[PDB]
Amino acid sequence: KVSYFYDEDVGNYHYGPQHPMKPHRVRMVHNLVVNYNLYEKLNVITPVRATRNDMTRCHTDEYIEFLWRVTPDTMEKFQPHQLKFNVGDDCPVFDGLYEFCSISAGGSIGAAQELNSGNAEIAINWAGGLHHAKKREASGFCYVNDIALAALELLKYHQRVLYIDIDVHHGDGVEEFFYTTDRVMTCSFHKFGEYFPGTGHIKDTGIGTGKNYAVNVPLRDGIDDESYESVFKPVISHIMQWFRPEAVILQCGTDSLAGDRLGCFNLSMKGHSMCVDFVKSFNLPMICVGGGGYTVRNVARVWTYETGLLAGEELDENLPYNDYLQYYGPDYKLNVLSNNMENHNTRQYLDSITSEIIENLRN
Amino acid sequence: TAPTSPYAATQEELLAFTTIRQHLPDTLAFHKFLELLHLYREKLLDKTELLNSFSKLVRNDNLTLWFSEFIRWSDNPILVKNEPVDERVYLPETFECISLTYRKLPDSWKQDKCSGRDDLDNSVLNDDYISVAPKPSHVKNIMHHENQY
Amino acid sequence: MKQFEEQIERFKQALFEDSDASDSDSSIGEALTNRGLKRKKGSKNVYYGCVGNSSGSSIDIDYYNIGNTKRGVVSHFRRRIDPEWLDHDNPYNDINIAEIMSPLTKPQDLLTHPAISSIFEQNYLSILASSALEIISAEHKYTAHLEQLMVALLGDDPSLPGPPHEVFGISPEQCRELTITVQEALEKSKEFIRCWTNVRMDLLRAIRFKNKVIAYCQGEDYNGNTQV
Amino acid sequence: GIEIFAALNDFTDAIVSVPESVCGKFTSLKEIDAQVRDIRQNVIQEIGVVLKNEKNDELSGEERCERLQKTLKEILPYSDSKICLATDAMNNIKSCIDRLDAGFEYVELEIPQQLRLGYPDDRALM
Amino acid sequence: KQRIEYEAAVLCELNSFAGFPTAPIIETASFDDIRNDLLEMG
Amino acid sequence: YCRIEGRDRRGLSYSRILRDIDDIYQRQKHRIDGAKLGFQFTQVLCDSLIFLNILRLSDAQLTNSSFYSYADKGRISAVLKALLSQFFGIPLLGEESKNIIGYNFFGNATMYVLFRLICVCYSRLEHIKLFVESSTIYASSTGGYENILNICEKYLKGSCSRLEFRKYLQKFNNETCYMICSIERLLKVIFYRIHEILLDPKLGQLLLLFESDGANSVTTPREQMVYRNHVESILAPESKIFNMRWYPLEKRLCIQQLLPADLTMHDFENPAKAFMYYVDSYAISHITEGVD
Ligand SMILES: [K+]
Ligand SMILES: [K+]
Ligand SMILES: [Zn+2]
């Protein structure tokens, strides 16, 4: 009884010639869900495209209308206004942009509406969860920030929401959206240093009445499954003890795996799925969205595993013959491994940051 | 068979250039011609000056015209305009800081409206603080991506 | 005159050169900015916000025109004979193109040739044929029941001699609507089966031919099994 | 003279071409087939109760058939999808298999006898 | 077979000399064929 | 393996080496941060057997290369042996004057690159030996460092392949011991430099000149200056000079880069000595040393 949103069109969009972000990856996921016969254990839905009045509760109407009117072949009149909204270089303009944004935001708002009305406990929208887009400009491959809309929907019934983020990059759009409120708490586990977006410092914990209600866990290179677990379980446990969330939005970016295009971590499929296990084990209403992920064979396999494990099933190790099978050679297994990349987190460092966090959380 | 490199010399142009050297009565004139070409390559020899010296070495009008056609010469008033970039692409870093990265907003930027906001979202969402990431200046030890497999 | 041709080509390349370019051999690493380090082989892709730089200066492509078609090429791993580069620095080392793309010329080579043998070891037909049977069977379990109801409604049922509307009391104007919809359903369900059966039988024809060839090109090594 | 194996070299390309068309179509089917199974089991139970008329006797025969009618009306748009997909797959595989068959007709000719009938002494023939 | 045999030689030569060849390029139709098609559609 | 090997190969590029030394020299000449002139590279070479180890590895690899014909192997082995023994002085109240006179070598970019490579190879071998000995796990064996040497010897002749090599290396679990594989690369670059010198017809006199200056007792300036003028003349009018000085007392190698009007000896203990050396230079040196 897991709501699983999926629109068939989202896999036909195309960012640009050699761009790293391919929505096609989502389609690959579905193509393994069907051939793994998980189609029958899931309540599969088709998202209602979000209107324009739905998308301008976070964003501004000027930015959303610009997104509406623009077009890749009639942007000789928009070319001046392009970079006023950060559009153009790594957030390009492509054919059918507004459709893609409406698809993803509609999936997220639909999941929130499923959870509001008791129709399920766990919802899945693998083609949403774009956490970088800001209120008045695109930012780092994301144009509209659907997660803020999902949370604004959840807050109608529930009273306190928790947004957990395990994308290697920082979730800056979401954190900046709810930075001065206590009703939503953001928690991010991100590589820090000389890295995108360069925010996310361990002393940035909200303002106003939001003081203490954010959590930034600045890690370093090469981190692996055991260290990640050792710093993930204590903080999550104390947040659930002291914050007492009612709804959980879990962001499942997969550029934190070993071998990614733009990643510097060393997790593996087991190390990544441990987080989903541990957050599920609290028996809460849980939306579970996608995120980063730029080596698409890894993304497909890991997201398939996490869906089969969120439902409650036990998928085989081998891979069922499907259309995108040859992407997964030469082994053809549902496993993503890790490499001998050298860790850079000394145990003393992890314990220091963990203690500083937990001492912050006691208020 | 043999592969054609990108922008490889075509046969017509090689023929024409060897006839140019042949009209040049000397191997010293041919060497001077190579010197002209090289000095144009090394950003010490202009375009029109290359054409002028080429003509004063070839003393033939049709070859001057063929060169000016190969050089892709065009005399037009080069127009240079300087347009500043929009205020919003750099203005953030003049805002009164609050923390390392969060900077208070000025009143002129809290003057645009989102039209789908009800009474809830006007009390949950953050309105007046931005997140201005920090800017490197002169990085001087750049890391690469080394795994080539 | 080869040196002269090289000179002419070099001059043509200089004319061809773009208005803005990268001259320094060192490329821009991650580096997350272009200030200071412009003219750095890829610094046009970098600025303030710059998620990253995905295109490194090792996959860059150079086009060479052969005959009538242009073929790109990865030219960072050329022979480029030098002291610094070892052979095992080349990813595409020991990938022999001349023997991967080569023809057979000998029937038994079917079982040793690298690429071809990797082709006769896939069992994608035997999976698809069984999937087709699994799909046909459920549909047929449904069609059999539709068909029984049909022979009842028409009236050609040996065990039901009376009028069908009577044997399950309904107005004779309800029986006609029911019969119409049942007829549509039964006809469509029969057509789907008739097509999927042709699909499956042709898959089986392919499987039969494949095994026959695997058994021919084994000569005296023919032990009944033909799983490569 | 000496013979290249042109047919035996095209056979190996046809044998690869065959699965892909139907691969796409098979998956597109499994989706539809899996979003219709509950309705089909409904229909089977309904036909059974209407045709036995003596084993599950809790109904009013006028309504016991209005339910079957509505259920049959529900399943109708899926049969059209299945028919379109089956005809597409049929055409694709037909062309591919015509090619493969025309090839195998020849690959059996330019292959030495001893390679398909064995040596004239490895035949029992009592 | 002749076409494959020609392509193999071309690619082995291009391999030794220049680099390692990537996938065949996906190009448009010819100028002549575009012309004829715009004609018969016109 | 990939980070180490990539950073390595990206480090020892000819032009990169030259640009590094040039940048340091330019920063000195103008006193940008208060840095005054002098030496731009300094390093101590203690052991004398490590050089024989390096010679062993070099000959091992040289018998298994495929660029050079049968005689170039002998040529290159000889040249390496000669430049090792002569310069580095490795055996292959009236006596301290030697250890007080630093021996001088003048060459061009090729020589500077060659010597930078040799110092790098030495440093890495020595760090290896120190880590095998001081670390109390593999030191417990009689010849763990020696086992490493014998294994590398095996591999470089073609008697062992690279997979066994790398998996055996993984036993040490050490980046410091990851650094052993780079020796093949370093040796390849070295052989290349040496060969391009053996074809450099201006080499002979140069190294011959070196031989000549390996016979004096303690030099007066004028001899060194006329040596330097010889060298500077043998090259084209455009070139730089690289000065490599050997202190056998401290067993220290120092390297600097000299342009036309530069001082060869930077330290004078009294103004009279300075004036003496100047006048000598004005006499002989092609361009007066020490003038702006
Ligand atoms: K908050
Ligand atoms: K994060
Ligand atoms: Zn990310």
CA distance E42 to chain D (A): 31
Is residue C38 within 8 Å of residue C21, measured between CB atoms?
no
Q: Return the SS3 of D118.
A: coil
**For residues C173 and C63, what is the distance between their CA atoms, to the nearest angstrom?**
75
Task: Round to whole Å and give the CA distance between A223 and A217.
Answer: 13
User: What one-character DSSP code corresponds to residue D115?
Assistant: G
Type of residue at F196: E
Contact C206 D61 (CB under 8 A): no
Q: How many domains does chain A have?
A: 1
Tokens of B34: 């190579």
Phi, psi at A216, each rounded to 5°: -115, 125
Residue A90 and residue C30: Cβ atoms within 8 Å? no
Q: How many CA atoms lie within 13 A of C103 on its CB side?
A: 19
Angstrom distance (rounded) from CA C147 to CA C183 = 9
Q: How far are the Cα atoms of C102, C104, C108 from residue E1, in angstroms, in the given order?
A: 10, 11, 19
Do B and D count as touching (3 or more CB pairs closer than 8 A)?
no
* CA–centroid distance, residue A132 to ligand 2 (Å): 11
Coil vs helix vs strand at A195: coil
| Identity of the amino acid at B112 | D
Among residues F103, F63, F64, F56, which one has the least CA distance to residue F80? F56
Identify the helix (H) or strand (E) that includes residue C142: helix C125-154
Q: Which two tokens stand for residue A247?
A: 């709804």
Determine which of A35, A170, A192, A196 to mutate to test the interface with C (most C C-beta atoms within 10 Å). A196
Contact C70 E21 (CB under 8 A): no
Of the residues A22, A131, A261, A321, the best mutation for testing chain C's interface (the one with the most C CB atoms within 10 Å of its CB) is: A321
Q: Indicate the SS3 state at residue C157.
A: coil
CA atoms within 13 A on the CB side of C14: 16
Nearest in space to F106 (alpha carbons), one of F223, F267, F269: F223
| CA–CA dist C208, D15 (Å, integer) | 11
Report CB contact under 8 Å: C77, E20.
yes
By the CB < 8 Å criterion, does F175 face chain B? no
Check CB contact under 8 Å for A194 and C30. Answer: yes
What 3-state class would DSSP assign to E19? coil
Residue (of C58, F181, C52, F3) closest to A222 by Cα position:
F3
Nearest C-alpha neighbor of D13 from the set A145, A88, F102, E4: E4
C 181-220 near D (Cβ less than 8 A): 181-182, 184-185, 188-189, 191-192, 195-196, 198-199, 202-203, 205-206, 209-210, 212-213, 216-217, 219-220
> What letters, b where the CB count within 10 A reaches 16 and e where it falls short, cover E16-41?
eebbbbeeeeeeeeeeeeeeeeeeee
CA-based Rg of chain E, rounded to a whole angstrom?
16
Three-class DSSP category at D18: helix
Contact F9 C84 (CB under 8 A): yes
| Rounded Cα gap, residues C9 and C3, in angstroms | 10
Contact A63, A332 (CB under 8 A): no
Q: Do residues F113 and F13 make contact, with C-beta atoms less than 8 angstroms apart?
A: no
Element (H, E) at C139: helix C125-154
Mutate to test the interface with D, among C149, C154, C212 (most CBs of D within 10 A): C149
Q: Tell me which residue has tokens 């809309």.
A: A149
Residue matched to tokens 């959870």 = A115
Residue listed under structure tokens 């309800």: C174
The CA distance from A285 to D82, in Å, is 37
Element (H, E) at A5: strand A2-5
3-state SS string for chain F: CHHHHHHHHHHCCHHHHHHHHHHHHHHHHCCCCCCCCCCCEEEECCCCHHHHHHHHHHHHHHCCCCCCCHHHHHHHHHHHHHHHHHHHCCCCCCCCHHHHCCEEEEECHHHHHHHHHHHHHHHHHHHHHHHHHHCCCCCCCCCHHHHHHHHHHHHHCCCCCHHHHHHHHHHHCCHHHHCCCCHHHHHHHHHHHHHHHHHCCCHHHHHHHHHHCCCCCCCCHHHHHHHHHHHHHHCCCCCCEEEEEEECCCCEEEEEEECCCCCCCCCCCCHHHHHHHHHHHHHHCCCCCCCC
* C-alpha to C-alpha distance for A206 and A215, rounded to whole angstroms: 9
Q: What is the 3-state secondary structure (H, E, C) of chain B?
A: CCCECCCCCCHHHHHHHHHHHHHCCCHHHHHHHHHHHHHHHCCCCCHHHHHHHHHHHHCCHHHHHHHHHHCCCCCCCCCCCCCCCCHHHCHHHHCCECCCCEECCCCCCCCCCCCCCCCCHHHHCCCCCEECCCCCCCCCCCCCCCCCC
Whole domain around residue A255: which residue ranges? 2-361
- Chain C residues touching B17 at Cβ < 8 A: 8
Do the Cβ atoms of A35 and D27 come within 8 Å? yes
Strands (E), chain E: none
Distance, first Cα to last Cα, chain F: 49
> Which of D23, D31, D37 comes nearest A34 by C-beta?
D31
> What backbone torsions phi and psi does residue A301 show, to the nearest 5 degrees?
-60, -45
Q: What sign does the CA torsion over F63, F64, F67, F69 have?
A: positive
> What gap in Å lies between CA A181 and CA A148, rounded to an integer?
13
Q: How far is the CA of B125 from the centre of ligand 1 (A)?
A: 9
CB contact under 8 A, F188 and C83: yes
Q: Buried b / exposed e across F20-41, counting CB within 10 Å, b at 16+?
A: ebeebbeebeeeeeeeeeeebb
Evaluate whether C97 touches E12 at the Cβ level (below 8 Å).
Answer: yes
Interface of E with C in 3-42 (CB under 8 A): 4-5, 7-8, 10-12, 14-22, 24-25, 27
| Token pair in block for residue A214 | 């954010």
Contact D43, C142 (CB under 8 A): yes
Tell me the CB-side half-sphere exposure of residue F85, using CA atoms within 13 A. Answer: 8
In angstroms, the Cα distances linking B75 to B48, B67, B72, C15 are 9, 15, 10, 17
Cβ contact, residue pair F9, C89, below 8 Å: yes
CB atoms A83 and B89 under 8 Å: yes
CA distance F49 to F55: 10
Amino acid residing at C212: K
Interface test with C, best of E13, E15, E28, E31 (most C CBs within 10 A): E15
Task: Catalogue the active-site residues of A.
Answer: 132
F61 near F187, Cβ under 8 Å? yes
Concatenated DSSP letters for A287-345?
EEE-----SHHHHHHHHHHHHHHHHT----SB----TTGGGGTTT-BS------PPP--
Cα–Cα distance, F108 to F18 (Å, whole number): 11
Measure F286 CA to nearest chain C CA, in Å: 36
Cite the beta strand spans of chain C per DSSP E: 64-66, 69-71
Which residues on E lie below 8 Å from C62 (Cβ)? 18-19
Phi-psi region at C48: left, alpha or beta (left = phi > 0; alpha = psi -120 to 50): beta
Separation of A154 CA from ligand 1 center, angstroms?
A: 15
**C174 in helix, strand or coil?**
helix
Q: How far apart are CA B125 and CA A279, in angstroms?
A: 26
Residues of B at the C interface (Cβ-Cβ below 8 Å)? Answer: 1, 3-9, 13-14, 17-18, 34, 37, 40-41, 71-72, 133, 135-139, 142-145, 148-149
Q: Which ligand is nearest to the CA of A292?
A: 3
- Using the beta-carbon criterion (under 8 Å), do C54 and A20 form an inter-chain contact? yes
* Whole-angstrom distance, CA of residue D26 vs CA of residue C68: 39
Spell A9-25 as b/e; 16+ CB within 10 A means b.
Answer: ebbebebeeeebbbbeb
Which amino acid does the sequence have at D27?
A: T
What's the alpha-carbon Rg for chain F, to the nearest Å?
Answer: 21
DSSP alpha helix (H) spans, chain A: 24-35, 52-55, 61-69, 97-116, 146-154, 172-177, 225-242, 269-280, 296-311, 347-360
Which chains are adjacent to chain F, needing at least 3 Cβ pairs under 8 Å? B, C
Instruction: Classify A150 as helix, strand or coil.
Output: helix
Cα A241 from Cα A236, distance rounded (Å): 9
Residues lining ion ligand 2 (Cβ < 5 A) are A 165, 167, 188, 190
H-state helical runs in chain D: 6-34, 37-52, 63-107
**Helix B47-58 with B27-41: angle, nearest 10 deg:** 170
Alpha carbon separation from C95 to A215, C59, C90, E14, F107 (Å, rounded): 50, 17, 10, 14, 43
Query: What is the C-alpha to C-alpha distance for residues F51 and F48, in angstroms, rounded to an integer?
Result: 6
- Burial classification of residue F275, based on how many CB atoms lie within 10 Å of its CB (0-12 exposed, 13-18 middle, 19 or more buried): exposed
Other Cβ atoms less than 10 A from the Cβ of A270: the count is 14
Rounded alpha-carbon distances, angstroms, from residue E18 to C61, C71, C77, C93, C101: 11, 11, 9, 14, 19
Cis status, amide bond into A197, omega within 30 of 0? yes
Helix (H, G, I), strand (E, B) or coil at D79: helix
Cβ-based contacts of A176 with chain B (< 8 Å): 102, 126, 129-131
SS3 A97: helix
Report DSSP state, residue C109.
G
- Measured between CB atoms, does E3 come within 8 Å of chain D? no
Task: Give the minimum alpha-carbon distance from B7 to chain C in angstroms, rounded to a whole number.
Answer: 6
Q: Which residues of B touch A207 (CB under 8 A)?
A: 98-99, 102, 129
Chain E interface disruption, residue of C75, C76, C90, most E CBs within 10 A: C75
* AA identity, residue F262: D
Q: List Cα–Cα distances, C103 to D12, D110, E5, in angstroms.
A: 11, 15, 8
* Radius of gyration of chain B, Cα coordinates, nearest whole angstrom: 31
Residue C87 has what DSSP assignment? G
Helix/strand/coil percentages in chain E, nearest 5: 65, 0, 35
A214: which strand partners? A186
A159, A168, A185: which is closest to A238 by C-alpha? A185
- Domain CATH for A314: 3.40.800.20
For residue F248, give both structure tokens.
Answer: 């056998």
CA nearest to B142 within chain F: F7
Using CA atoms, how far apart are residues A119 and B110, in angstroms rounded to an integer?
A: 39
SS3 C161: coil
Angle at the Cα of C204 from the Cα atoms of C202 and C207, rounded to 5 degrees: 115
Which residue's structure tokens are 């055991």? A226
Nearest to A188 by CA among A292, A101, A114: A292
**CB atoms < 10 A from the CB of F164, how many?**
12
User: Distances in Å between the alpha carbon of A168 and those of A150, A176, A233?
Assistant: 21, 17, 17
CA-CA distances (angstroms) from residue C192 to C179, C188, D41, F178?
Answer: 20, 6, 18, 64
CB of F23 within 8 Å of any CB in chain B? no
Q: Measure in Å the smallest separation between the Cα of C143 and chain E Cα atoms.
A: 47
DSSP A11: G
Phi, psi of B71 (to 5 degrees): -60, -15
Judged by a CB distance cut-off of 8 A, whether residue D9 touches chain E is yes
Mark yes or no for CB contact D83/C142 under 8 Å.
Answer: no
Residue type, C131: S
Which helix (H) or strand (E) segment is C149 a member of?
A: helix C125-154
Residues of E whose CB is below 8 A from D8:
none
Residue A306 makes CB contacts below 8 A (sequence gap 6+) with A252, A272, A273, A276, A288
Tokens of A208: 């106003």
Nearest CA to CA, how far is C143 from chain A (Å)? 22
Measure A167 CA to ligand 2 centroid, in angstroms: 4
Contact F114, F229 (CB under 8 A): no
* A312 Cα distance to chain centroid: 21
Please tell me the total number of residues recorded for chain A in this structure: 363
Note whether C51 contacts A195, CB cutoff 8 Å. no
Name the resolution in angstroms. Answer: 3.2
- For residues A324 and A31, is the Cβ–Cβ distance under 8 A? yes
C86/F188 Cβ within 8 A: yes
- The number of residues making up chain C comes to 228
Spatial distance between the Cα atoms of F106 and F255, rounded to a whole number of angstroms: 10
Q: How far is C49 from chain A (nearest CA, A)?
A: 7
Report the residue count for chain E.
42
Q: How close are the terminal C-alpha atoms of chain B, in Å?
A: 31
Question: How many angstroms does the Cα of residue A182 sit away from the middle of ligand 2?
Answer: 20
User: Cis ω on the peptide bond leading into residue A330 (within 30° of 0)?
Assistant: yes
Rounded CA-CA distance F208/B57 in Å is 49
Tell me the HSE value of B41 on the side-chain side, using a 13 A CA sphere: 15
